[PDB]
Ligand binder design. Structure first.
Ligand code: CA
Ligand code: CA
Lengths: 476, 488, 436, 332
């Protein structure tokens, strides 16, 4: 009572199993009908391959009856419902038509098996599915195009030989030569030459003897008109594939050229201009061009949360003020983190300016330099956090909200920063968290010994009724 | 009557008018250049030229019975339509197209195709039909290919007529380039004359070559022009097909914009395989089931009034079934529809867990959600499509024992599509309707009280403290003002 | 150079070019020696010398230049000699270079030499970074690819002709004339799918001609696609400018906008395109990193803004925020930057051009001409809504590019800097009290 | 582009004749035939054949006579290599033009296809589905696909104001409240107007619906209608405005910013809407004008009889923490 899942791996393995008989029938049936040496010479081979193809054809009917479908988001495993979904469709008519024998209407001849060509839907489904699964989208795409062109060329080669046989072998210069002649008589020459004739005709090359009869003029004109669309399709598919490979570089190069034009037009200094060009080369070479937020907006909101948690929650938990934090708040802070990139020599923050954000070092090395910018008090590596006190909302301390130290980027660094508003927005839902986070900041300033505990109580937040209660002493 | 140009009747007439124009463009040049075709089937041309002239005349009748949009409303006035049409340059071309050459007909010949060459001027009516077909067809790329193939044949058919006309002027059988002598066993027939001439131009214009070399200046100059046309015509074929192919590939890319970029990023950021598998299986679900993701971005294509109508027609039926929105105005419910945003959950995903902050109300468009236990194995109840949960959380009703946290765990069985209304989004909408807030809060009281989630005495203590403070603050507002009025 | 930075060292770019030339020589000469059996001794004397020179270039590249390359490690560059050498030694580039110099008279004895293609790719990246309008080099590279394909096709055709027998059939090479030119002629006529060749008679000839024609069809498709991509990338900017101008003119024609206003819009479009190269610069600025955009704004405007007497004593971060909120507006000649009696709500910085403060008994008489770098109208930022009215006409003299900071932008900045807000209010009171 | 091809073809024709002269006329089959022969030796024949040879060789379509000498082989190889670069440049230039002309339709067809996918996905009813399809046909037929705001966003504010004055200032000065408005304010208001297009039978506003916008009819006819849509009280033509009092924040209004009439569009109408917020933003810098606008609206509301209300009714939404702030602020 097994039911196949269309998104599963076993269903895709079946698509390859059914597509091979379907592709074999589209290639070999017309060749055996037109080239009589192929059918008679290898009869014992075709008896095995016809039986194997037939058995897989009937097996596809059973698989179609046991393939589930999503109804209300749940795969349907009821045998009755799976049968009613398939039987009333058009594909059931085409599937049964491919398998019903033509015993009523020579049974060994390939012409009675031409109903097998109606099973083409499994072949196109397999190519559609493989395009998504494959790791190389462009190698598969050029291989898929060649296969379609090769089958059309092979079909036209068999049509030309059948037209030559109907008109007469060697009766004029256009048709295939006399097969009574041993030079043209064997099967290897007549298939390859007709393949050679078909390729030249369908790719707008020509180089073939001109037609003689009026029926021959019509066939070549039709082939030239079809072949001008075949060549346009080949050119269009290769040209469109080329555009896709260079699409990412061309978008980035157009950005660099526009920035370069801005710097010369605006008389940007040579030192600043050379650094910006140098910065852009590092981003492309290290594959840091793409924006994380632009990448992940296509994901669903819940699945984007688990992607962001797997990257930032480990480093955010190591922050001292967030050590006692609830796991619910830590999730919201992770989504609120926004990335920053700096070049060598860039100042993350300077002494005495307003600090409104905390930074976490994803990558790169940061130095706590002095005012000179060359004497390094401390070294900050990946996972380090600075500015943690600044995001905490407390009335101005002895030091205040302003920064204490000059943080400079020694090399290119990636930082993730949590802003003041972002922390304040997130903590509104969690009022207990606000008390805990302020308490660690109260204790951290106690570690540095900036203010007294009762002096910090003026800086700390108070309840609205107690603040009114403190004022209730004043009104009287 | 008066036809509407956007109507089906006017479109059906445009497709009718294609055939007289296509007949005149194709047959008249062939009859002029092939004397065997004109003289051999002279009876059939008298019938078909009368039919084309009749349908050309009926086109001018339809032009006088076609309305136009002035001030956005269709004008059905016969006098105003007629006064508008005769001023147009199309009227001049319509008159010239059917302009009688019958007076000068006999002098050149009893029946001459060149005299009917003025019928070519109705070609703008054919381009209008092709433009109108492209707008409303289901297959815009398949029609563009077929329209290009029609353009290819007409140019090749025209070149074949010019080859036969020049080869007749130079004399048949003079050299290998011109059309062979009719004394040859096959070349006396009219069918061979067209088939050989069409095959000659098909060799050139499709860049095959394989033609006999010319022998004189007229044949040299014809070849130089044909080779240049074959090069410029070939580049038009590649460019049109490469644009069709690029339009096809981009369209499927638009449905699923970024798959490789996410997959590449997850490799660079070393996302764990289990989570990486889930993203890959998510993208497989989109391709197989052809689901859409940027539901909001598609609706930005529509104008704001039409976007609201589309949104209301989809979401108003389920929004009205909410217990707290039962006593709401028609205008208020339509404003709440636009604030709904879609959420999609994979199987086994948790919409909400017990103890989590809840500030949203989820409405189940499709899929099944289960109220699982703390362990998660047993299901208390199953919520199907059209149902909802979390409507108390967006209300902010005083005296609730909920605690602004989720009461029970909700798990998604299968793929579930939900629309959520946040507490903030309801709050901005409610600002325009102050009286509507009070009804929802009152409705919120009843739901909590029936399930015993509101202690009245605990609620009253919150209310009494607030109203005493509100009374005190008004006194405090007096106290600050009474002090400051007498302080100064 | 004690250490070499691959990205910016022109010497390393030149050395990469020489390595590319050596690899190109090996890649061209292996098929020639494989296909063509006999060469004159004078050819041997210079071919062997060039082969030794190319092998010496390979040896110098693997030993000196690649070990002398500094690299970014965790965001920080490494200049240490041992670390640089070890980084090169533990690399796929080193593996490929050693495989290229693998030893393995035989023409295929030098077949490992084709593995120095990573140097070619690096040289391509360096060149497209160094030179503007890289589509010219892309065209040159595609042409070189086509020439090498035809060279390989000629070598294969000579191999086939000599293998079947020279002069055996009409399809194979006769043995008359220069072997390379007659084989290159066949290669061109087949890989371009021109045709016009003797027909293949034997099965081997038919198969060879079929595959050579199919490959030629796809080679022609590749060339057409490359040229189409080059043309699109070249003309994208002009296409965008023309489409924007056409949309604007179509709108103005639909709404019956007068010809004078249409002419002014068209003149602005033409001048802005020809000068700036883009219609709006903010679309470019919001794509850059925040630090890069801030640095560019600082470099353009910080020296001018910091010298403004109104903003002295304010926070440097607040000045930086104003620099980020400055917007660039181009004024047509004789345009009114300020009109007397109009509301003043902006501060203008003259990036380019001149403005004239018209005044006098007659009026419309130049009193002072302000050149580039001037800042005027800064007092209107401190005023309350409706507080400031312009007191004189300021008229642009020629095409003037101004940087404008709106009062709303300054008010939105000042909420984050209460100290500077209080200082600016105090300065506003002092300006009001001292002038009155 | 065609002229460049002709100059190259003509130049290559002359080089072929010069090469044939250098090698010798008639020495072999590849070069031009003998000049001394009267069949070949005249200027009309030798230029036209060489023009034919150059076109036949560069375009790589037809078959040129085979070369005989190694010097001749090199020239034909050079022409074929040059003709490949010319032909690939031709297809790239023409192919890029065709993409540019089709780009407007191609991006419009993607919008319809994206919307058409949404309606079948969300099971939009056929009455509403055909309404959307009919709307997109109106946009393409009358060429209204591109948004006005996106068209003029690159223009400077001075040029944008100059365009907007010529479109809306005549109709905006006909509004009763904006009768005596200052010239500076009127430029601010016409920049705030947003285009709106309504299908036939669409309701601009309904009785009892909250109204925060004022509409000016650029084109089209609107009808004031009863609860049953067919019966119409009055007709609003192009240049008329309604909802002017909704954007004014009068202190006391019996209306309560709710529409008192049903307005319906007889056909497609282009409306420009001035919102309540946009009027507030415009009059921040014109405080005296704001007072005159409210007084004029108050006078109009007196004539209707819908002015006097909320004498003792006031709404207070200050937070308990924010109201506590003033008590702290007053003490310092
Ligand atoms: Ca050919
Ligand atoms: Ca060809």
């Amino acid at each position: 009572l097994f039911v196949l899942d269309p998104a599963g791996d076993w269903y895709y393995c079946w698509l390859f199993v059914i597509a091979m008989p379907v592709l074999y029938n589209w290639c070999l049936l017309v060749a055996r009908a037109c080239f009589s040496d192929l059918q008679k010479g290898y009869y014992l081979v075709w008896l095995v391959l016809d039986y194997v193809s037939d058995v897989v054809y009937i097996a596809d009917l059973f698989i179609r009856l046991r393939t589930g479908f999503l109804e209300q988001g749940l795969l349907v495993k009821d045998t009755k419902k799976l049968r009613d979904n398939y039987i009333h469709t058009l594909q059931f008519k085409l599937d049964v038509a491919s398998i019903i024998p033509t015993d009523l209407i020579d049974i060994h001849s390939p012409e009675v098996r031409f109903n097998r060509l109606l099973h083409f839907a499994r072949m196109f489904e397999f190519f559609d599915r493989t395009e998504t699964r494959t790791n190389y989208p462009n190698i598969f795409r050029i291989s898929n195009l060649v296969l379609y062109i090769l089958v059309i060329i092979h079909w036209n080669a068999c049509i030309y030989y059948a037209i030559s046989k109907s008109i007469g072998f060697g009766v004029d210069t256009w048709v295939y030569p006399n097969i009574t002649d041993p030079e043209y008589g064997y099967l290897a020459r007549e298939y390859i030459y007709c393949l050679y004739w078909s390729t030249l005709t369908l790719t707008t090359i020509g180089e073939t003897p001109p037609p003689v009869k009026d029926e021959e003029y019509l066939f070549v004109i039709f082939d030239f008109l079809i072949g001008v669309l075949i060549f346009a399709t080949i050119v269009g598919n290769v040209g469109s594939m080329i555009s896709n490979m260079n699409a990412t570089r061309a978008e980035f190069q157009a950005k660099i050229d526009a920035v370069k034009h801005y710097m010369q037009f605006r008389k940007v200094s040579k030192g600043m201009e050379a650094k910006v060009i140098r910065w852009f080369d590092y981003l492309w070479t290290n594959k840091k061009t793409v924006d994380e937020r632009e990448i992940l907006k296509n994901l669903p909101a819940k699945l984007r949360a688990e992607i962001a948690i797997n990257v930032h929650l480990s480093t955010l938990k190591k922050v001292r003020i967030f050590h006692d934090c609830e796991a619910g708040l830590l999730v919201e802070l992770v989504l609120k983190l926004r990335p920053q990139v700096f070049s060598p020599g860039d100042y993350i923050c300077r002494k005495g300016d307003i600090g409104k954000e905390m930074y976490i070092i994803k990558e790169g090395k940061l130095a706590v330099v002095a005012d000179d910018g060359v004497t390094q008090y401390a070294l900050l590596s990946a996972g380090s956090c600075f500015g943690e006190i600044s995001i905490l909302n407390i009335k101005g301390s002895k030091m205040g909200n302003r920064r204490t130290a000059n943080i400079r980027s020694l090399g290119y660094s990636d930082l993730f920063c949590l802003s003041k508003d972002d922390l304040m927005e997130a903590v509104t839902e969690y009022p207990d968290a606000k008390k805990v986070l302020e308490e660690r900041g109260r204790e951290i300033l106690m570690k540095e010994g900036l203010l007294d505990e009762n002096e910090v109580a003026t800086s700390m937040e108070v309840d609205v009724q107690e603040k009114l209660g403190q004022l209730e002493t004043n009104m009287e | 009557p008066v036809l509407d140009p956007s109507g089906d009747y006017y479109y059906w007439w445009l497709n009718t008018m294609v055939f007289p124009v296509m007949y005149n463009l194709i047959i008249l040049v062939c009859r002029a250049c092939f004397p065997d075709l004109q003289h051999g089937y002279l009876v059939a041309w008298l019938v078909l030229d009368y039919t084309s002239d009749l349908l050309y005349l009926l086109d001018m009748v339809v032009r006088f019975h076609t309305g136009f949009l002035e001030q956005g409303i269709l004008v059905v006035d016969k006098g105003r339509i007629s006064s508008r049409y005769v001023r147009t340059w199309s009227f001049f071309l319509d008159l010239a197209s059917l302009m009688p050459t019958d007076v000068v007909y006999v002098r050149l010949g009893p029946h001459t195709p060149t005299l009917r060459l003025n019928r070519f001027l109705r070609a703008p009516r054919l381009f209008e039909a092709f433009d109108r077909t492209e707008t409303r067809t289901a297959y815009p790329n398949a029609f563009r290919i077929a329209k290009l193939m029609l353009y290819i044949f007409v140019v090749i058919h025209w070149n074949s007529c010019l080859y036969f006309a020049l080869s007749r002027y130079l004399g048949f059988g003079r050299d290998a380039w011109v059309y062979p002598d009719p004394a040859q066993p096959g070349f006396e027939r009219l069918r061979r004359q067209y088939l050989y001439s069409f095959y000659f131009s098909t060799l050139i214009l499709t860049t095959v070559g394989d033609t006999p070399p010319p022998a004189r200046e007229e044949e040299y100059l014809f070849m130089v022009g044909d080779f240049l046309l074959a090069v410029m015509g070939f580049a038009t074929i590649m460019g049109s097909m490469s644009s069709v192919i690029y339009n096809m590939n981009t369209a499927d890319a638009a449905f699923y914009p970024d798959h490789a970029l996410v997959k590449k990023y997850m490799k660079l950021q070393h996302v764990n395989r289990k989570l990486e598998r889930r993203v890959i299986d998510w993208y497989q679900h989109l391709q197989i089931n052809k689901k859409m993701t940027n539901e909001v971005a598609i609706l930005q294509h529509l104008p704001e009034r039409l976007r609201a109508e589309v949104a209301v027609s989809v979401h108003l039926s389920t929004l009205s079934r909410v217990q707290i929105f039962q006593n709401c105005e028609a205008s208020l419910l339509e404003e709440l529809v636009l604030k709904l945003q879609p959420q999609t959950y994979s199987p086994g995903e948790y919409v909400c867990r017990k103890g989590d902050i809840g500030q949203e109300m989820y409405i189940i468009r499709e899929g099944q959600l289960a109220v699982v236990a703390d362990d998660g194995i047993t299901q208390y109840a199953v919520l199907g499509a059209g149902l909802y949960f979390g409507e108390i959380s967006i209300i902010n009703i005083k005296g609730n024992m909920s605690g602004n946290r989720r009461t029970a765990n909700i798990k998604s069985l299968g793929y579930s599509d939900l629309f959520c209304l946040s507490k903030e989004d309801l709050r901005e909408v409610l600002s325009e309707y102050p009286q509507a807030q009070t009804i929802m809060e009152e409705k919120g009281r009843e739901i909590l009280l029936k399930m015993n989630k509101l202690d009245v005495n605990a609620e009253a203590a919150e209310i009494a403290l607030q109203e005493a403070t509100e009374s005190r603050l008004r006194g405090l507002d007096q106290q600050l003002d009474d002090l400051q009025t007498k302080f100064a | 150079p004690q250490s070499i930075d691959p990205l910016t060292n022109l010497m390393y770019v030149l050395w990469l070019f020489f390595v590319v030339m050596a690899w190109n020589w090996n890649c061209w000469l292996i098929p020639v020696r494989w296909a063509f059996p006999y060469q004159t001794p004078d050819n041997i004397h210079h071919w062997l010398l060039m082969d030794y020179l190319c092998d010496l270039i390979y040896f110098l590249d693997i030993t000196v230049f690649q070990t002398r390359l500094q690299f970014v490690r965790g965001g920080d560059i490494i200049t240490d000699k041992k670390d640089m050498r070890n980084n090169y030694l533990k690399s796929r580039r080193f593996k490929m270079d050693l495989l290229s110099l693998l030893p393995l008279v035989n023409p295929l004895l030098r077949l490992p030499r084709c593995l120095k293609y990573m140097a070619f790719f690096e040289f391509n990246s360096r060149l497209e970074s160094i030179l503007s309008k890289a589509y010219v080099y892309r065209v040159i590279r595609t042409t070189a690819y086509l020439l090498y394909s035809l060279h390989l096709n000629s070598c294969l055709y000579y191999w086939a002709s000599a293998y079947q027998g020279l002069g055996s059939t009409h399809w194979v090479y006769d043995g008359v004339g220069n072997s390379y030119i007659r084989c290159y002629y066949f290669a061109v006529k087949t890989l371009i799918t021109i045709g016009g060749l003797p027909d293949p008679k034997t099965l081997f000839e038919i198969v060879f001609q079929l595959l050579n024609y199919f490959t030629g069809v796809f080679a022609f498709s590749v060339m057409i696609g490359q040229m189409r991509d080059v043309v699109g990338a070249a003309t994208a900017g002009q296409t965008y400018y023309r489409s924007c101008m056409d949309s604007t003119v179509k709108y103005m024609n639909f709404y019956k906008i007068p010809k004078s206003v249409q002419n002014r819009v068209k003149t602005w479009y033409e001048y802005t395109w020809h000068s700036q190269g883009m219609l709006d610069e903010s679309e470019l600025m919001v794509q850059l990193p925040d630090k890069m955009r801030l640095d560019l704004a600082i470099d353009v405007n910080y020296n001018i803004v910091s010298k403004v007497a109104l903003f002295q004593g304010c926070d440097r971060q607040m000045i930086f925020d104003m620099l980020k909120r400055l917007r660039s507006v181009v004024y047509l000649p004789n345009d009114y930057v300020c009109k007397k009696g109009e509301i003043g709500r902006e501060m203008y910085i003259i990036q380019a051009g001149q403005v004239q403060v018209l005044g006098g008994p007659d009026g419309k008489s130049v009193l002072v001409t302000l050149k580039a770098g001037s800042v005027f109208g800064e007092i209107s930022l401190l005023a309350v809504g409706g507080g400031n009215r312009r007191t004189a006409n300021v008229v642009a003299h020629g095409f003037t590019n101004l940087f404008i900071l709106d009062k709303k932008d300054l008010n939105e900045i000042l909420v984050h800097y209460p100290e500077s807000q209080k200082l600016l209010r105090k300065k506003a009171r002092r300006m009001l009290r001292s002038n009155n």
